[PDB]
Amino acid sequence: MDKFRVQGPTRLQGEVTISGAKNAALPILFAALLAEEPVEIQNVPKLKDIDTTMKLLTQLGTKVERXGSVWIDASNVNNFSAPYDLVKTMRASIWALGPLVARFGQGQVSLPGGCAIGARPVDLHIFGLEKLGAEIKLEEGYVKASVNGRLKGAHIVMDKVSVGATVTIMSAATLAEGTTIIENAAREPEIVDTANFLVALGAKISGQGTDRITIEGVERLGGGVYRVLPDRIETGTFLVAAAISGGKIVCRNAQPDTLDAVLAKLREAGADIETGEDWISLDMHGKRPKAVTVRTAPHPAFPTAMQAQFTLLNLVAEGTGVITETIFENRFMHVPELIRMGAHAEIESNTVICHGVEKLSGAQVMATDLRASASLVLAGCIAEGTTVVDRIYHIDRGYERIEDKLRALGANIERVKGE
Amino acid sequence: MDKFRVQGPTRLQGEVTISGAKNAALPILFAALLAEEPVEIQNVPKLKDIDTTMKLLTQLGTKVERXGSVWIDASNVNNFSAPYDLVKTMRASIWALGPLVARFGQGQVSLPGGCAIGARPVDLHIFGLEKLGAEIKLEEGYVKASVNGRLKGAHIVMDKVSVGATVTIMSAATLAEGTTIIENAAREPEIVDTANFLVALGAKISGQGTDRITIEGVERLGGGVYRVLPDRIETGTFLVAAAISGGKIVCRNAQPDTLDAVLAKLREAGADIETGEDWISLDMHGKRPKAVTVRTAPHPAFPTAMQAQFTLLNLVAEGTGVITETIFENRFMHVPELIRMGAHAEIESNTVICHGVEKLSGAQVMATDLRASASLVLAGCIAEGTTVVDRIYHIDRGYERIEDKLRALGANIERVKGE
Amino acid sequence: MDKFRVQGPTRLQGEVTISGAKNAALPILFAALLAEEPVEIQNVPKLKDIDTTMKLLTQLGTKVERXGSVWIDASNVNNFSAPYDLVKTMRASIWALGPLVARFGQGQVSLPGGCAIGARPVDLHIFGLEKLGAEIKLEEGYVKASVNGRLKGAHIVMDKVSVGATVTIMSAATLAEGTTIIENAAREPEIVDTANFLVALGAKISGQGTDRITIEGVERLGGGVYRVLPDRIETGTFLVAAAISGGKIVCRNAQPDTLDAVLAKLREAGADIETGEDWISLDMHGKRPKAVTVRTAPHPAFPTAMQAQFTLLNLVAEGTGVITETIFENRFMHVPELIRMGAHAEIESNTVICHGVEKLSGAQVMATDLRASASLVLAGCIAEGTTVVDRIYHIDRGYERIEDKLRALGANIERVKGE
Amino acid sequence: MDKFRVQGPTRLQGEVTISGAKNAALPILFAALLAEEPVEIQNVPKLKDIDTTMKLLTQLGTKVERXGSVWIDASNVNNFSAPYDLVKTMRASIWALGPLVARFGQGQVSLPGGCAIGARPVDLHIFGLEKLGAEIKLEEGYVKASVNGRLKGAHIVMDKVSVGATVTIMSAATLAEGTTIIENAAREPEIVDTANFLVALGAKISGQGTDRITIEGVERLGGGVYRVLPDRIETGTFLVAAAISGGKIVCRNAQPDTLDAVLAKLREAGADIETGEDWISLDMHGKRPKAVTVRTAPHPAFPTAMQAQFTLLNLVAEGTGVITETIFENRFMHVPELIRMGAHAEIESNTVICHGVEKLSGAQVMATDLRASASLVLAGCIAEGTTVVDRIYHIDRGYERIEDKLRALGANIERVKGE
Numbered sequence A, B, C, D: 001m002d003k004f005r006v007q008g009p010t011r012l013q014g015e016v017t018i019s020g021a022k023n024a025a026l027p028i029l030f031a032a033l034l035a036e037e038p039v040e041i042q043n044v045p046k047l048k049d050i051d052t053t054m055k056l057l058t059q060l061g062t063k064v065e066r067x068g069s070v071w072i073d074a075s076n077v078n079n080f081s082a083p084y085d086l087v088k089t090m091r092a093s094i095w096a097l098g099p100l101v102a103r104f105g106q107g108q109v110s111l112p113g114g115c116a117i118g119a120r121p122v123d124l125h126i127f128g129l130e131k132l133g134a135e136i137k138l139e140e141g142y143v144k145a146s147v148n149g150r151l152k153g154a155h156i157v158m159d160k161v162s163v164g165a166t167v168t169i170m171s172a173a174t175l176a177e178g179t180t181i182i183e184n185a186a187r188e189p190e191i192v193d194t195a196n197f198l199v200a201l202g203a204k205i206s207g208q209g210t211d212r213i214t215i216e217g218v219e220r221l222g223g224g225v226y227r228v229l230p231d232r233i234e235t236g237t238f239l240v241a242a243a244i245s246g247g248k249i250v251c252r253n254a255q256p257d258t259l260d261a262v263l264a265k266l267r268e269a270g271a272d273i274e275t276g277e278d279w280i281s282l283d284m285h286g287k288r289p290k291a292v293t294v295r296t297a298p299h300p301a302f303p304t305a306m307q308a309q310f311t312l313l314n315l316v317a318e319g320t321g322v323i324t325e326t327i328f329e330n331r332f333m334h335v336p337e338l339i340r341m342g343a344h345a346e347i348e349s350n351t352v353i354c355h356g357v358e359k360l361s362g363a364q365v366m367a368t369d370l371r372a373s374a375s376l377v378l379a380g381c382i383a384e385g386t387t388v389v390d391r392i393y394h395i396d397r398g399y400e401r402i403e404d405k406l407r408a409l410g411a412n413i414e415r416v417k418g419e
């Protein structure tokens, strides 16, 4: 069981180059199941989830190869089932159902169980496919979908904003007969990126980025080359790294317009931020951050994927900061761990009352999820002494070589064998 | 204390002509404070709040008068205060602060206290004006704002979706120096309508209806003629009137695209719905409605202003319906009253578990707010016997002659004076 | 519409004599319906609710007259109904159902609608009576109960702690055939007081004050004399009065053991508290209070009836105080009003985040409920300037001559007419 | 990674003998640290947590051994620290802090991190010890407590009901100087059992089982023999096993008075229940259960440790059942798993809306916690087909030979080796 041994305090500063967005690469890779011709997806980060996705695609009869890019050849797809033992390691595989049924008239994915940060039901995904004409049946833990011929475009109103469901529906609609309209669609940058990828394959889509997406089905999708956009969460994570350590940092290969909420909040915390066409710089000028108030919500509001990181910022900030999480029912698992490091906070329903302290104390903590693990690692960087973050495998799911990037910023970190 | 005596059951059917939107007319009337030339706002409903708004405007030195239209002449505004005894009757008067400060460099509105359905703080309004350069201070219960010279355009990220705050900021920005960008802006139809009104006066706005509104300030705004859009909540209310009484109805002067969520939910309840360019028809074919699940959220999702009405629908529907309110913390006040009429339901935090029953029994109930009062009146229409809805004054705030429109649909309703 | 005009700031200090408990007198007065012989209830406060109760009792055919005591002669009862017009002004009228059905085999009370602080359903009351053998129906807004012969003792497990329901069931069981056991009964001091009153009339009860109350029915109850215990909420209100004004006070005719939670919290806020057999003294030594964290819950925990008052204390305390209300869904109505006076707070679900300030500014505020009104009046006493609390009629419901008592403590207060 | 392979459907019926209470054995075992003479604790279940507790005790310099009983000789404790690697596997080890500091004037336990069902802070434990005079510092992830001489008795008001904190304080107080009074103490049967155990060692305690526990310290505690009471949760689990499979069962070595709430709810579901001095029988008469409504709360109300099991009951019951969890913020982890087996439900905040179905379908599910694992195993027993419950190690933490006991009731179950 790998772990990270971090020695602090160390001011994090310097430069870092942002990798491709994990949450854009994943939906785009599954969307590739729709491509009949050759496809090359560029700037794909090297993450555990990308490996799992490739393993799943390959089992479906896809030809997959990667490096900076991931080359996909769907053409000859002969299997249409996502095994239980595979989706249990990555629920994002639910995104295979849509393309499979839309292109091959059938598909079955193991119904994902609960996740650490929430139950994360997938009802809207199913509701959407059903509205497009698919017939779904649940048996042996497998959501089995089928349709006689092509799906039919439909006017679908989402009764809850879902990034995942928007992707599933939008993807399946590209090969549908007629026009589909998604009301109250998710506006996340990844949705826009997935949309443009589909359009590159020949799909006809408009409205991506707004709460109404219109898709006009076509007979088939070809192939092509598409470069994934920068990972805004990785970017926000490193900007926070500097903000909490009094450092200064410049993120290269960034996309500023995808972080208005985060940048605004960082400025409220006292950061000196400047942006360029493809870079963001943050300088704390050696100052301790000012406590801020946050409320997660669908894009363009403050993203829930940044909440754990900002919880940390508040826990070492000047004043009382309050964070309210409205997307996932169980995303405060990092709090009890940071408290072990000396933080002071109380959880009341879905909001954490933070009472910032001068300095944290190194201690043995346990990563519970992707963003929490990154938060605990950053905590170790600025804490006084040695911190051991157990279960860092979580971090390998969404951060490409974070160990190296952090070290290059002045961190004293070492990955060490488990047990 | 006026009351409504309703005798049922009576199947509501026929036609109704929708009046101008209450929530478009209000923000537009206050926006008129920016106009230097004469203004004519058409299709303005005759509601108690419109009277109060006119009173307030006149009290600021505006020349106001009305019929179907409301004619405004704010060329010589010579007062900049919205008195307590006035805003205590209509919290929407907070919308005067923005235009006053943007055009005259000053303004003071009584800080509104709590409302029945929620505390409804106005912090985002103030936060927005402050970001535009205004200096605000609260003294003696009055929110006093000032700015030397014009306001300056700014990039403002709304850490909460607010219809009111979006209106305040967007309105004040039209006369600001530079460009303003509102991130995570409210996308309600009224916002779009208010934006187009401002544009008609000469303002430069784009993005209305999306989560990013861009305003480029100008030196001054002129005058003109603008027709308010159809009231989608009145429309939804009457469509529900038919859906719960097994009737059929056609709403004239309607705007279908503003009700996707509502129409989708009505179909789920079993309604046969047809739409035209400016009309909507619903036929229940004498059927009892099927219970539905609702989750209120910012537009284009299911509107909280229709929640009470749908609570009623579920309470007389076949099955167990669940309604989750996410906009206002206390908007279930109608529930205890309907229970007096024989309804069955339990309130768990912010959601009501409904157990539909065949029929309701007439009884004495009390209106607690605008939408609840309309719900109780509809309940009386389909309940068995005589229902008395006390304090219907609430209904006069947002429904233009609902008594007449309902009667024309077959309702047995009478307005009883003094208690 | 009476109002209170308060001039501040003024230290509140001196002495006050606590009146009889409003919430002990009420259930005991209704319990008297069980008495076949004369009954004298001593130390009954002069409150609006006591008048309404006497009005209701008299209209049931009871002979009632009062001063310090309330003399009851329920030997004859010619009416077994509590009218809408009457219960709509006091939901506590529901307590008449139990005794009426237990002694006369029948009874009906108008089903109370919603209340300001919560829906306050009365299901457990009905559930309890039904378990004792009563048959209950809801027709035309009235809950009609009946039983052929006596009620039969039963083992009732309350699946929720309810003061009201415990009183209803315990009272009705005294005339039941057999033994009744109430599991998870409310342990409030008033329950104990009501129990001892019944025992004085000849009833056989044990366990009052614990979560298991055992009642052994008897054929009939006689009469007697019983003195109501001190009102712990009035006591807590005056102790808070001193704590927030840096003053000192001694409450006479108090019962310390009924306020462990409150006294503990006041000490946490920095109060110097001393207690005697029947008195409590609190001295702030001119100190500003320290913010505290509160979580309302059934007795002996912190009482929800003290919550509004402690919200005030936190709002003028040094630090960030957090209050969580778990008894009533909407009991933060005082918050928006105090904010008008300069307080700083945010409401997140069922908890208020308070940010204490040095001084409050006088302003026009509106009482929304009993405890809130008292809170707004105390606010006016310590605020800078003139405060006008509209609708103080609310305060007359549960505070006997609060004006006089506050004045005797140094308050500058006066009641004025004119809505 | 051990798993359970279950073949269904199978009616569970017959008899089972209840083991000693896990949650009474644990606090009593730690309480033994106070004993200067050898102690024999009888009827101790063979659970993983008992092993861990013995490991910890031994590691403190205690002589421990077991079979049906666990023999303890803590006469020579020479070590006072609970290590991270140990408490991370069982947070209940926090109960070592109290006795250690009360008897040896010092003690340090690793601050437990978050748990699956909730953050489970331990603040009240620390607050209590501090009130008794201990000085508590937090360093390196270790809560370190110390006191010069003996602790002093104090009047402690628990501003929240906590089983664990009540045990910690009550245990430490036995060796304190003076009298301690715990206000708003937990009333759980285990508290009563732990109290009587301490009294057996010579401690002076009264009030256990009520809101107020009074402890009068003594110089030292001796030794003795104490038999742990029956495990009410195990009992409830098997009663539910019968109730959901139409079977009949008799639990031997049971203690009925500890399950009033559960038995009442089972009757509401339609069970025919009879009780004896030390046994409980439940017969469903082949009847499918009726949906019920539950709201967890402190004893004697419906226990949260039975919530998962009752969620299952509702999911296969006739009707819509609603369960509201008020003790732990994340105890619905079994829901998503049961949904994989065909169950239908929605989670809204802290309550689950259940829509019972005829029969469940076997599938691969994952145990997430102790009670959830038992629920998934019972689900497998009544589901159609083969169910595989992964991670059943969870079940070994609180159920002694559940495999054997279930088999003896007609279950087709088998523990297949890792993987």
Ligand SMILES: CC(=O)N[C@H]1[C@@H](OP(=O)(O)OP(=O)(O)OC[C@H]2O[C@@H](n3ccc(=O)[nH]c3=O)[C@H](O)[C@@H]2O)O[C@H](CO)[C@@H](O)[C@@H]1O[C@@](C)(OP(=O)(O)O)C(=O)O
Binding pocket: A023, A026, A092, A118, A119, A120, A121, A122, A123, A124, A125, A126, A160, A161, A162, A163, A164, A165, A188, A233, A303, A304, A305, A327, A328, A329, A370, A371, A398
């Ligand atoms: C793969 C991917 O796109 N993941 C990201 C994606 O995930 P997801 O698609 O599940 O989001 P959704 O918008 O659909 O869910 C939002 C809310 O909607 C509910 N929901 C979702 C679908 C549905 O059918 N029904 C439903 O009720 C959720 O249970 C939740 O309460 O959107 C989230 C919100 O912006 C990110 O927070 C997440 O990232 C994380 C946690 O990734 P993870 O899944 O890998 O763990 C992250 O990296 O931070």
Ligand SMILES: CC(=O)N[C@H]1[C@@H](OP(=O)(O)OP(=O)(O)OC[C@H]2O[C@@H](n3ccc(=O)[nH]c3=O)[C@H](O)[C@@H]2O)O[C@H](CO)[C@@H](O)[C@@H]1O[C@@](C)(OP(=O)(O)O)C(=O)O
Binding pocket: B022, B023, B024, B026, B092, B118, B119, B120, B121, B122, B123, B124, B125, B126, B160, B161, B162, B163, B164, B165, B186, B188, B233, B303, B304, B305, B306, B327, B328, B329, B370, B371, B398
């Ligand atoms: C005047 C008018 O336009 N009113 C409509 C308008 O009202 P409002 O501007 O207050 O909505 P907001 O979007 O700003 O509020 C939404 C949420 O944001 C909070 N909020 C709002 C402003 C702020 O500074 N801070 C803040 O925390 C609210 O307290 C709430 O929790 O938008 C609501 C949502 O779509 C309608 O539900 C409402 O209609 C009602 C209730 O009208 P009412 O105000 O007249 O009573 C209705 O007719 O149903």
Ligand SMILES: CC(=O)N[C@H]1[C@@H](OP(=O)(O)OP(=O)(O)OC[C@H]2O[C@@H](n3ccc(=O)[nH]c3=O)[C@H](O)[C@@H]2O)O[C@H](CO)[C@@H](O)[C@@H]1O[C@@](C)(OP(=O)(O)O)C(=O)O
Binding pocket: C023, C024, C026, C092, C118, C119, C120, C121, C122, C123, C124, C125, C126, C160, C161, C162, C163, C164, C165, C190, C233, C303, C304, C305, C306, C327, C328, C329, C370, C371, C398
């Ligand atoms: C008359 C009297 O004894 N009133 C006091 C009494 O009132 P009540 O009996 O209604 O309390 P309950 O214990 O029954 O209510 C507690 C919780 O239980 C719910 N509840 C109650 C009864 C029931 O059948 N079902 C049910 O679901 C409530 O709706 C609430 O969510 O107990 C409350 C809690 O300690 C006091 O807060 C209240 O006092 C106030 C507000 O008086 P009020 O009734 O006059 O307005 C107060 O003076 O502060």
Ligand SMILES: CC(=O)N[C@H]1[C@@H](OP(=O)(O)OP(=O)(O)OC[C@H]2O[C@@H](n3ccc(=O)[nH]c3=O)[C@H](O)[C@@H]2O)O[C@H](CO)[C@@H](O)[C@@H]1O[C@@](C)(OP(=O)(O)O)C(=O)O
Binding pocket: D023, D026, D092, D118, D119, D120, D121, D122, D123, D124, D125, D126, D160, D161, D162, D163, D164, D165, D186, D188, D303, D304, D305, D306, D327, D328, D329, D370, D371, D398
């Ligand atoms: C070891 C043991 O006695 N465990 C049982 C024991 O556990 P615990 O001591 O933690 O209960 P508490 O009463 O103290 O906690 C109740 C509530 O109080 C909070 N709490 C607790 C202590 C504190 O200092 N502060 C605080 O805020 C909790 O975080 C929770 O929100 O009481 C619970 C309630 O009756 C059982 O539900 C639990 O059983 C479970 C989950 O066992 P577990 O601890 O092994 O996981 C079970 O079902 O077996």
